[model samples]
Target: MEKSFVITDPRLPDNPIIFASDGFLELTEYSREEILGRNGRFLQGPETDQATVQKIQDAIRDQREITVQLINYTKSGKKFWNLLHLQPMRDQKGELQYFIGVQLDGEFIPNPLLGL
Candidate 1:
């Protein structure tokens, strides 16, 4: 499978979606309209670990790169482990501009901490 990419407008308050690749839309089972104005958090669910979520938030806050494995659910409630690679994009002046997220299909690795 090809890598799925999602670009968000970090300058926006809610960091609205700027672009989501076709593969990403298909993988998440979401329409472009459904994702255009929303953050990618919609893919997260009750089973997703808050710690992993925090790691992503903290990395975004600090403008760093982070790779994490987390459980995510599709629109139909089907679960899959996703290896999420999130990074902050910057311009020539080194100013934070956007966030690019790469979602990859992850193996089903059981975690005692996450109880999954």
Candidate 2:
């Protein structure tokens, strides 16, 4: 079982959200109307680390998978740590197609002393 499910378009300017599960809506506290066509970056805020964002960007540019545990906020501005898994989805011909972004939020407190 998945905590949340999402399919996005890397071909778009911001990797816009195309489809998502009901669990996703519940997690983000955003309605379908608000999230369906927007970038997943909506969950990001000033507290979100820029370097981590860049890493994700580079991976997407290369059509590679990346798993990250980073801070994210809900529509109500409640903060949580999201364990994000992003991977490229391909067509039958093995051409890059959409992106699969799975996210699970939890009480993940990080120790500033530890670095990956």
Candidate 3:
């Protein structure tokens, strides 16, 4: 899949919208059925960065935009850079409804708080 194929601003977290075509499978190696109803963290392994994970959680807790460049894994535990860029979707009544997370790639950067 070409990095240029940006699936920007899809209907995400609005009742679990499928944000990918067949191409998403090529990158994350997960089928549409498998990814639904599950958080992206499912693909992560023990090697994932805890600080980044906490930041994501905190951002979610705060109910705002959450963006982080962290380590994540594939179904086979193959490590790669995961940039979990998230944005919120609200309703007309000023209520939160959807939250879209665009999972992108990053360079091989070590965690500031390294935990090998």
Candidate 4:
């Protein structure tokens, strides 16, 4: 199901969240007002993997797509494994428009490449 997703404006500084799905709100337990205009990194916690975060950043900078499983914390500080897929959305003009991130929680598949 294409349920949990967020559309972020990469044109904006820090690529702030512009649109969030109801499933995303429910998954993160963050209100629309609270999640809007914020970067996805806010979901990261102390125990979250930095290398995975770096990989995501690199993918964004390179304007490519990436899928990784990492730890993410909810509003109540509860941690969950997030299977995040991030892709750059381009317009008809081939200009970068937005970044769509789809999140799946509590689903883990071990990957040697990801050191899981």
Candidate 5:
């Protein structure tokens, strides 16, 4: 695999997506730093459906686990449906710490570009 994108700006490095395991690799082509405090909107363009985003945001803000068929492009401009699952991680004190995100194969979801 090749790295298509690089973090040229220093501010982008403080984002959490870089440290979160699954973010800064071939998976989302999104670094922990790039997404640390950013919303999922950075990865989306006009082609991305807004309805889906709204639904996903609604679910997440409501503190409910949300799994939606997400289509996103890699740094190489390759597209895929992440089959992403977003879970909220809280401590025993019920304080929010981090989010556990798992991206599955999109092939099962019907769209093809995942390279599965």
Candidate 6:
């Protein structure tokens, strides 16, 4: 099973979600109705890193592939470490089409230094 989803053209306004896999819905505890047509930023919360978010934005703008691990919130307000892989999809003519976002649930390993 894969937690994968696709968003519309990045150049388009909003760059909304065009498709989401069942794996994605299950991972986030969100329904199709709640996820479709929304920006992926909805999963971000107060504790999420702004620098990481900006990195994603930069990759999107450059039409490049990127992988980043960050904190994301589920529908039930549960926080999880999400290892995200984002790639830009292109058509036969090499024109940008969609952006595919894949999420992998990462194991939470507490830092001994942080004394968690």
What's the TM-score of each model vs. the native?
0.90, 0.89, 0.73, 0.93, 0.66, 0.87
Model 5, 6-102: lDDT tens per residue? 2212124322343444433656665565565554556666556667778777865665678777667766677775566767666698865555556
Better of 2 and 6 by TM-score: 2
18-66: candidate 6 lDDT, tens digit per residue: 7889998888989989988889999999878788899999999899999
- Candidate 2 lDDT for residue 10: 71
Give lDDT for model 1: 0.86
On lDDT, the candidate that comes out on top is 4
By TM-score, who's the top model here?
A: 4
Residue-wise lDDT of candidate 2 within 30-97, one digit each (tens)?
88889888888889997887788898989988999998877899889998788889999999999888
Across residues 23-68, which tens digit of lDDT does each residue of candidate 4 receive?
A: 9999999999999999999999997889999999999999999998
- What TM value does model 4 have? 0.93
Name the better of 3 and 6 by TM-score: 6
Error of 5 at 94 (Å): 1.6
Clashing residue pairs, candidate 1? none
**Candidate 6 has what TM-score?**
0.87
Angstrom error at residue 98, model 5: 1.7
Candidate 3, pairs of clashing residues = none
Model 1 spans > 4 angstroms off: 108-116
Cα lDDT computed for each candidate against the true fold = 0.86, 0.84, 0.63, 0.93, 0.56, 0.83
Q: Which scores greater on TM-score, model 1 or model 2?
A: 1
Give the better candidate number (1 or 6) by lDDT. Answer: 1
